[PDB]
Amino acid sequence: MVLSEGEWQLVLHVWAKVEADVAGHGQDILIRLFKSHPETLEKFDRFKHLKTEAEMKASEDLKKHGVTVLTALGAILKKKGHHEAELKPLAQSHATKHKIPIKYLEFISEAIIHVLHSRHPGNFGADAQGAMNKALELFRKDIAAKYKELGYQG
């Protein structure tokens, strides 16, 4: 796939709003993912035990991980499609160490779009949401292709 420049602009314009509060968005997004798809919490041997949303909100470790995830995702989006380098180490650890199925990257893509929609309705109308979905599908497609080369296509 190839996004046009206008689509990238819509993606980087709402992302600049996320970046005003990286740790708060990270929390929202991971909690929305775990609530929606509790099976994904099992992949975290660190958080696994968190039983409620209140516990999740209070977990300092969870919030740090959220900042890690978003920082890496933001560095990938800012490349505007030229992200091969950034993807390599990410696809190797998720395919060999963590073992995250493509299906779970779709689930978090959904949680990212839900949260931007709630927190930025004015910078996240239909065209901007289509552009963000297109940028995340691109991301999932390049990752999936690297999974296959690494031997996982999981």
Binding residues, by number, are 65, 94
Site for ligand HEM in 66-85 (CB under 6 A): 68-69, 72-73
Q: How far apart are CA 152 and CA 119, in angstroms?
A: 35
Q: Which stretch binds ligand HEM (CB under 6 A): 89-97, 114-122, 127-135, 146-154?
A: 89-97
Q: Does residue number 152 form part of the binding site for ligand HEM (CB under 6 A)?
A: no
User: In the chain, how many H helices and how many E strands?
Assistant: 7, 0
Site for ligand HEM in 31-60 (CB under 6 A): 40, 43-44, 46
Radius of gyration for the chain, computed over Cα atoms and rounded to the nearest angstrom? 15
| 131 closest CA partner among 2, 3, 13, 1 | 3
The values of phi and psi at residue 124, to 5°, are -135, 45
Token digits of residue 65: 């991980």
Q: How far apart are CA 89 and CA 93, in angstroms?
A: 6
Give the residue, chosen from 98, 103, 141, 148, that forms a contact with ligand HEM under the rule CB under 6 A.
98
Site for ligand HEM in 103-142 (CB under 6 A): 104-105, 108
Q: How far is the CB of 36 from ligand HEM (least distance, A)?
A: 11
Q: Does residue number 18 form part of the binding site for ligand HEM (CB under 6 A)?
A: no
Q: How far is the CB of 99 from ligand HEM (least distance, A)?
A: 8
Q: How far is the CB of 46 from ligand HEM (least distance, A)?
A: 5
Site residues, ligand HEM (CB under 6 A): 40, 43-44, 46, 65, 68-69, 72-73, 90, 93-94, 98, 100, 104-105, 108
